[PDB]
């Protein structure tokens, strides 16, 4: 109840600075003034390079069907098994102050505090992505963000990049459909997007795809309304998630996976490891795993939502990486991003702490809250008591072939986009076309528009024709 | 024309990562992939704690009337004297991605590259401020920003704070008037707000107020339209400034000052050093100094607009600080903020470099681009050639009186706000009332609303009555 | 007992990196390799700008005589009152890897975890200092450290600076005496050096000087042996402190103060506020306060000794600052240094946490371990429950006189140094002279040596004569 | 000649702080005091995690024999071709203030500013290393540095680690020989240690080993003298290099390589890619390449020596990495270390700038000195003028075999160490034994000593016997 400094000393006057006489100059000995101002000056930290605008909530995951036959992952071992989790939803391009209701993919990050480590499933509200190789991420993101000279958004850059990257057609179609702007985070799906690996106790391998289906149903915002809400309420989605949980209308998602046995995978490498493609659900139907429920709002947004650190590379025994090139790059990127954005010791912050015990030889670093007791910080050592490797946790070995080199991917950039285009109801197709026209129509370089239109035409003649037609009407 | 790494080595493939066989894992030896991703991961820096959303432009200042009789400031010594300058305009509360057209004071920061050092005039588009003591800045800003728990804006906090800080009434009235949302940065005035000190060659002292009057005229956005534009174009003001300069419609401002001699100032301390008050232009009319013109857009936004560092404490001989408590705190705050946000050596970045020679004993620090030749980094020393103090630049001494202590200011919070309220034309008064009602009306704590309404009533009975009525009608 | 990653996931192989085939390239998907290497890469933090090489220990302070008649400081209110504390001893110029047994003042930093906040007494093993104005600290330290060009120590710089700063004579004499190199941290005294202020419950003011006298007695190392030990064992003092405590030979110090009533200061401002001078002990004898005992070694050196943050400005009710210009500058310097070296939230690290409750409106910042529950982060506010100022803690007001300006101190640089020179026994005087000769004798600029010798001659004719002669014999 | 602030404004008084009256408190408006102190507070940056204590110098490399037949490396294309370079020599374990003359490997880092990028050869004064897998580096270094609890060096940890890592025997033997402490940096050799790859214009591949032989000859310090010098002059090696260059006694090294054709290498993978082993000089004799000469001291130590960034991964066309596991980890480690220690934009500091043009899409980041002109920061793009990949620079592809997994290396840890032991003259062998005895003899755990002695015995019965015998005599 008494105001204090950061060292617990009481503050006598929090309204007036120490001054040399009523109208005299302010004194340097007003240490609290200095401290208060200095800490205020250091409140801002760098925002996430992408997915800066987000909302979070605590929850739980409950297994409905054991997956022990496919993975030794502890949190999925028994029916009814509960695991605490934390989720963060977000947009992609917008900065800290941007509006929620913009057209953009939505982040669907999940951190499961399992008994064998924190497992992160860092997905999106889309099963695919715009690119397939991590080396192109900075290029994609740069084209999606601000003009380095004017600081204004550049549709010219957005489309110039996509017109030279046909592999983005599938995701561009999803981005421009109605689902490009969800009604709320509670009304969108979640996907791991990448094909991941599951390994059971016997060492049997399976390639899987995660699908988090919203139990609230898919609902979107028409483009016009979304723009209106972007002005009337830029935190529309954040507020919605918070109010829903405070009103005890806990949103939930049913998680099911597509399971592809190793043997099967050997025939579909070009599809399975290309994140710009989906795996037919007729060939490999969804198998229910459990339910995710968000039931508790953060205590403090900055401490939990802003400081939380997710990484696709945060695996737990039983779940491993696949040769998906985009995923491969992400395995490095996130841990690296965390160290710059939060710090070498970000894992020590409450929201990032593991439920399972952490026993390392890792030491020091900035703001190290806990370095331990031990005099032994190296391994191998002659002290039986200290942490040792667990051979049991080695990843499953797989065969490597050919030469080390720079290989290109498949060129089947049109088939799946066309399939999606054909599945869209007439009313959504008109929106798809108008959304593209409104964006692509802002481009000045006629050569970029033509290249892009030829691309859409290759997906479906009507697709390209309709797009070209909508632009002419402006 | 050849893509290279940061060390100038050519890049062979910028589309595909090095992989162990066509469908094999990505290799750690792809150093460029690592570098490209790692540098991308470090692109974000902390945004300014306040005034994060801004736009900048290069320009010049030209003296129309020498001020040598009042100040020995070199850049104001001769008629026609030109000085290069850089300006940054901004809002206050919004983060990097926020919209331009929001109700908020606007920053009017100017950096003059004079022959005797970089002189910064860090003003606002208002002659006054909400508080008078720097110790309250973090409190004011916290109330103006996001709820620490929900991350949503809180009118409850905004008004709770103002209802307990009657000294804010004057500026709140300005904030809520039409000028609260300018049509563009080119259509608002600029002010130093604080009373500053001018000293001539003879050592004569004058207290002054800076007034930058827009030569394009004052123009504002009605609240409704502003909200609409906030959605349709969040970078409306940034784009406007850039287009105007690219179209050669160089915006300009006429600078004039109010000059109060030492002898006069002796009787007006309570008004002169209170930033919530203005000085009558009838008693002390504006005296023209020169013209500021913005005629060149930035080469790169991040390098120039984001990294530029301004400080009210960046004085040049002839211009000094006054005992204004708010100003006094700012003398510390900015340099401190720069060191955290940009770095100890931010002055070495092109946009922050002084035109005038920099000769110090300051050394090292992170990313030190230039440490010099000298073996002598201490003073006093026996080397005549090294930089020495210039007694000529000592500030003018002034008398100090009474006891060191925590003094409060005057309680005259209503008179000037009432004067302003009485000068507003009927149509703007209606807007003033509706703007307040829309905001204060969102508060839940009836005790806060009542306290605030009693405050407005004390400014003018009609003022408070109209506000109360407006709220009741919702 | 199982080795894990920072997220608690088990490590399968801590001896071999993931590789594409026995002799194939290392894979980027070995996330643990990446993490382990990356955290290792961030273990180093910037060392303290001064006093980088140190040792620490936990202990207690026990009051033997209540000081309630002179100060309302809670930790000194009752006889027998115990207060937990942490101490850090160090040299001044040496970097992290430098040897302990070098000639240099020794730091004597103490952090008392009192019930009204952490009180820091940041003193040295000397009652005085080399300079009297904080504006000269960077200059003094630069001259004391490495040549910016060669990175070698420079006696030319050391003496050039002292030869132009006669106020350093007193401390130079102490530095060059036998006490310039203590046998161990347990065999040196501690002093607050500066005159501080004590205020009792009635508001009565007293100026005080802190004296921590070693209960183990003063013992020093002859110059030759110290140099030998600097090679044979660079951590001689650190090891000594640790072994002594592990062997239960707890070192202790008896703290007593010199108490000067406010009114008495009227004739001593020139002495009392000039840190290059001491106050006569005959006029103002030592008054015992209590005993400090170090009885527990750190759990981890980096976490406690390296990360601890001390500040002379960390006062508690009853103890305040004096107008000593050097002290005044330190009031700013330390908190500022902490924010750069450790971080904005360094107060949250265990070693820096207050025992007394910390209730602020300060929020966020890098690595914020605790932001709290409250939605209210601004004051004044309408929530009675939130932290409020305690008028009772306001500092005692004192009168200010004259003009704001740049004033110079006293010119009596010789009297006290001469008194000390006359008190030294013949054998220590020979050492004093030889120590100076060995150092000053390395200077090349004959003008610097002459200026310095004239200075010593002014302290005492014999002093200067002996120094000049000792140098001649080289 | 006039002292100024960082913004070029003149300083009036650099000896006295602004004060409210002669004996009044210091004023916060003394912005220069604040700035001077604040910048001084930020002078320290984190030291290198290893090799913190070093010295540097500028020089040149002149080709004596063209290597065009083996590598297309531009700087080695013609006889007489000169390339500017910068070198940094250092120890390994010691911190910034440690002494030069300690037993430890010496760093031999070289940065060649070639016309096709900065090529870094980051070697040591030994052809081998203690470990063969990067995953063990943090463990090795931790054992070599300070006890986490006491902060004292721990021979118990040093030997515990080596006793469990027999692959270190070869390098330990070199470390303990006379060459463990060079007389000066000018009297030691330099090696790349790892086997690197050379590829010529026709695409032919060769595996190479770099050997920089000192033209001043090998000279060492006996252990006793080294310890003496460690106390008398901790910067003995730094001073030596500087004086030599200032006296125009430019030290030089003759570089020659061992060249192993791809076909030959196919049979020696276990030796070639194991850094604890050397390639026979009879089978593959040294082939002279050119001469390295150091002829210019740094302008400023901090700016050049402290801030320079080297990386084994900084290759230039014609030189590539080999599957050496230790090297592989280093390819990641250095760039990562630079980003933490110096910053994302360290490549922009003068000492790190490339001579060859740098054309990227990399942008922003902290302290970005140059972001350029371009509006185009993404690739692919439709602007012919912007930087594009150079397929010509792709690395040579090589075959990968088997399974992805955690493979262990060769177990031949004794043969080469024995060969070296047999080549040492009697007098050096006695030193080798005594050096080991003095160190290993300090270990308490008899089980560690026994394990280690059995290891030496396995190298050579006499080796182990002599070591065991030397210890017994203590
Ligand atoms: C080359 C490909 C990718 C790269 C290099 C990349 C990089 C990054 C980076 C640097 C961050 C910021 C992390 C932090 O600062 O904590 C991030 C966040 C995020 N990314 Fe990715 N990403 C890629 C692919 C993807 C994909 C395909 C998805 C989903 C399928 C995805 C979903 C997300 C999400 C949800 C976040 C926000 C996490 C949070 O809430 O903290 N990313 N990414
Ligand atoms: C106690 C009072 C105030 C405090 C403590 C304070 C503090 C700050 C801080 C810390 C910044 C960020 C600086 C940076 O990161 O470079 C800033 C920026 C700014 N402030 Fe203030 N401020 C106060 C009063 C005012 C007033 C009265 C005005 C104008 C009359 C003003 C105008 C501005 C402007 C224009 C900027 C943006 C400068 C830019 O474009 O970089 N401030 N302030
Ligand atoms: C796993 C093996 C190794 C790792 C992880 C490693 C890591 C590092 C790191 C992090 C640095 C500091 C870089 C900086 O802060 O700029 C460094 C510096 C250095 N290392 Fe290594 N290193 C390894 C092997 C080696 C080897 C085998 C040699 C020589 C054969 C070597 C020679 C050096 C040198 C000379 C420096 C100092 C460079 C300078 O002067 O700035 N290292 N190393
Ligand atoms: Cl980093
Ligand atoms: Cl800082």
């Amino acid at each position: 109840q008494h105001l204090t400094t950061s060292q617990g000393s009481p503050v006598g006057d929090n309204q007036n600075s120490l001054t040399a006489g009523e109208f005299g100059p302010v004194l340097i000995q007003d240490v609290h003034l200095l401290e208060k101002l200095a800490h205020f000056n250091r409140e801002r930290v760098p925002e996430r390079v992408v997915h800066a605008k987000g909302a979070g909530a605590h929850g739980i995951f409950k297994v409905s069907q054991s997956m022990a036959q496919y993975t030794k992952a502890d949190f999925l071992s028994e029916v009814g098994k509960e695991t605490p989790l934390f989720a963060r939803f977000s947009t992609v391009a917008g900065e800290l102050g941007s509006s929620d209701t913009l057209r953009d993919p939505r982040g669907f990050a999940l951190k499961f505090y399992t008994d064998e480590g924190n497992y992160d499933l860092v997905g999106n509200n889309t099963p695919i992505f715009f690119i397939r190789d991590a080396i192109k991420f900075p290029d994609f993101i740069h084209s999606q963000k601000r003009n380095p000279r004017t600081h204004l958004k550049s549709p010219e850059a957005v489309w110039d990049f996509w017109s030279h990257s046909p592999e983005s057609l599938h995701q561009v179609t999803i981005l421009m459909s109605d689902r490009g702007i969800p009604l709320s985070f509670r009304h969108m799906h979640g996907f791991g997007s990448h094909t991941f690996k599951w390994v059971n106790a016997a060492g049997e391998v399976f390639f899987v795809k995660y699908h988090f289906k919203t139990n609230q149903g898919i609902k979107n915002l028409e483009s016009q309304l979304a723009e209106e809400i972007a002005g009337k309420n830029p935190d529309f989605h954040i507020e919605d998630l918070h109010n829903a949980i405070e009103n005890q209308e806990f949103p939930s998602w049913t998680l099911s996976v597509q399971i592809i046995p190793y043997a099967d995978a050997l025939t579909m490498k070009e599809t399975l490891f290309d994140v710009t493609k989906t795996v037919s659900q007729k060939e490999y139907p969804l198998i229910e795993v459990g339910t995710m429920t968000l039931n508790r709002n953060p205590e403090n947004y900055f401490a939990e939502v802003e400081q939380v650190t997710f990484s696709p590379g945060n695996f737990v025994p039983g779940i491993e990486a696949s040769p998906d090139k985009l995923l491969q790059g992400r395995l490095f990127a996130y841990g690296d991003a965390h160290r710059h954005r939060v710090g070498a010791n970000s894992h020590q912050l409450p929201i990032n702490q593991a439920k399972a015990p952490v026993n390392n030889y890792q030491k020091d670093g900035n703001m190290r809250f806990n370095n331990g007791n031990s005099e032994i910080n190296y391994e191998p050592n002659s002290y039986t008591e200290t942490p040792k490797e667990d051979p049991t946790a080695k990843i499953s070995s797989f065969e490597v072939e050919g030469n080390v080199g720079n290989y290109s991917y498949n060129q089947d950039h049109f088939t799946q986009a066309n399939a999606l285009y054909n599945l869209l109801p007439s009313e959504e197709k008109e929106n798809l076309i108008n959304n593209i026209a409104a964006s692509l129509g802002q481009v000045k370089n006629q050569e970029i528009i033509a290249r892009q239109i030829d691309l859409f035409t290759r997906v479906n003649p009507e697709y390209g024709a309709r797009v070209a037609q909508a632009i002419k009407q402006q």
Side-chain angles (χ1 to χ4, degrees), chain A:
Chain A
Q1 298 192 317
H2 271 323
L3 177 65
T4 70
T5 61
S6 68
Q7 285 294 277
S9 179
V11 174
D13 192 336
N14 194 46
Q15 326 302 150
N16 311 293
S17 298
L18 266 182
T19 230
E22 185 180 5
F23 297 108
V26 174
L27 309 184
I28 200 173
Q29 63 169 267
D30 191 334
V31 297
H32 176 244
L33 167 64
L34 265 30
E35 171 181 295
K36 190 178 178 185
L37 257 34
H39 190 280
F40 167 72
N41 277 340
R42 293 168 175 69
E43 286 183 15
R44 315 280 93 100
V45 297
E47 62 180 32
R48 293 168 170 66
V49 66
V50 286
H51 293 270
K53 187 64 153 46
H58 291 278
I60 65 176
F61 180 77
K62 193 180 191 178
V63 176
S64 65
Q65 287 192 304
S66 170
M67 290 288 116
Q69 66 171 107
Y70 306 115
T71 174
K72 49 172 171 163
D74 188 271
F75 77 110
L76 300 175
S77 64
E78 288 174 46
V79 171
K81 188 159 195 169
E82 274 182 35
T83 299
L85 70 74
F86 184 71
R88 181 168 181 289
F89 301 111
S90 53
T91 46
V92 177
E95 296 82 10
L96 282 187
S98 60
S99 308
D100 289 333
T101 61
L102 301 179
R103 187 161 292 288
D104 221 24
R106 296 308 199 277
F108 199 105
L110 275 31
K111 176 180 293 302
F112 300 82
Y113 302 90
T114 88
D115 295 330
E116 301 195 334
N118 288 171
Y119 170 52
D120 296 335
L121 191 293
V122 189
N124 276 333
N125 70 332
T126 169
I128 56 174
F129 202 61
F130 307 86
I131 53 176
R132 350 138 104 165
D133 197 305
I135 196 164
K136 299 271 56 167
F137 198 65
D139 296 296
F140 171 50
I141 298 305
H142 279 182
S143 72
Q144 287 289 306
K145 284 170 169 281
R146 298 161 185 286
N147 184 108
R149 192 149 201 294
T150 64
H151 202 61
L152 305 177
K153 288 254 174 167
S154 176
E156 261 249 351
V158 164
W159 292 101
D160 184 24
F161 181 79
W162 281 335
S163 73
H164 284 290
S165 310
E167 70 273 23
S168 66
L169 290 159
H170 195 182
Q171 174 57 200
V172 164
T173 301
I174 292 183
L175 206 216
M176 296 294 152
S177 72
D178 291 340
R179 303 190 180 198
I181 307 180
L183 173 62
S184 88
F185 293 139
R186 300 148 53 231
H187 300 288
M188 55 179 206
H189 294 317
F191 308 82
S193 295
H194 305 295
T195 298
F196 288 91
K197 242 198 218 175
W198 273 11
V199 185
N200 60 34
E204 283 158 57
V205 176
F206 306 82
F207 288 88
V208 307
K209 292 238 142 170
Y210 294 85
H211 297 251
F212 292 83
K213 293 206 151 193
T214 170
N215 295 330
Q216 293 68 232
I218 294 291
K219 313 191 78 177
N220 317 299
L221 286 170
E222 229 60 358
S223 295
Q224 234 186 69
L225 220 209
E227 188 180 72
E228 192 184 89
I229 297 175
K232 292 183 174 178
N233 183 0
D235 303 318
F236 184 75
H237 289 164
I238 298 175
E239 181 173 13
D240 168 284
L241 211 220
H242 184 274
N243 291 334
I245 293 179
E246 226 57 293
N247 290 345
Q248 282 163 40
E249 282 182 32
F250 305 151
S252 63
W253 285 261
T254 296
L255 167 68
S256 33
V257 295
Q258 271 177 294
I259 301 181
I260 297 95
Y262 177 17
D264 283 48
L266 291 181
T267 63
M268 349 159 250
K269 300 199 171 185
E270 299 174 29
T271 301
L272 223 51
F273 309 149
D274 185 331
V275 78
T276 61
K277 299 185 172 58
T278 47
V279 171
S280 173
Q281 257 150 281
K282 279 184 178 176
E283 286 174 48
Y284 299 96
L286 298 184
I287 298 179
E288 200 183 279
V289 181
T291 296
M292 160 182 59
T293 302
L294 268 23
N295 56 33
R296 192 179 104 235
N297 286 144
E299 252 183 55
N300 176 274
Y301 183 94
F302 183 87
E304 293 170 50
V305 188
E306 186 61 40
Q307 289 185 143
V308 63
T309 55
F310 301 95
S311 176
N314 278 161
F315 294 113
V316 289
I319 310 183
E320 310 172 350
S322 76
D324 178 317
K325 287 181 197 176
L326 199 72
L327 203 216
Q328 292 274 135
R330 302 178 68 205
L331 299 178
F332 160 64
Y334 293 66
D336 180 59
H338 301 166
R339 299 184 272 262
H340 165 71
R341 180 170 69 74
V342 185
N345 294 308
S346 62
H347 61 280
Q348 290 193 156
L349 295 173
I351 197 64
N352 299 315
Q353 283 169 16
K355 182 183 192 310
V358 171
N359 304 300
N360 280 160
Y361 290 107
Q362 293 181 33
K363 295 281 172 169
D364 311 344
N366 184 65
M367 286 288 285
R368 160 59 61 135
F369 195 88
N370 171 223
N371 246 176
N373 264 10
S374 199
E375 294 199 350
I376 297 132
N377 61 176
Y378 61 89
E379 194 285 320
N381 58 68
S382 296
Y383 310 79
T384 296
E385 19 131 332
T386 66
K388 312 262 180 252
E389 54 190 39
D390 178 6
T392 259
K394 269 145 100 289
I395 69 169
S396 63
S397 62
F398 56 105
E399 185 174 65
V400 69
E401 228 167 29
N403 295 327
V404 159
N406 299 285
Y407 298 86
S408 299
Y409 269 134
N410 179 88
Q411 294 197 340
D412 179 42
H413 312 306
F414 319 94
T415 302
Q416 304 210 332
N418 183 51
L420 169 55
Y421 177 88
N422 292 318
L423 292 172
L424 300 173
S426 61
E427 60 275 37
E428 182 165 16
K429 285 199 191 186
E430 194 78 308
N431 289 335
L432 185 248
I433 305 300
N434 290 319
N435 287 328
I436 293 175
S439 184
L440 179 54
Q442 297 177 57
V443 179
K444 299 264 189 161
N445 199 324
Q446 289 157 16
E447 293 186 354
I448 290 176
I449 296 179
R451 182 185 306 114
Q452 187 62 49
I453 281 172
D454 293 342
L455 251 44
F456 284 125
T457 296
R458 290 204 54 182
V459 174
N460 188 109
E462 178 189 298
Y463 198 163
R466 288 234 242 156
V467 172
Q469 173 186 13
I471 300 178
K472 213 186 285 191
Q473 315 183 328
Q474 314 178 316

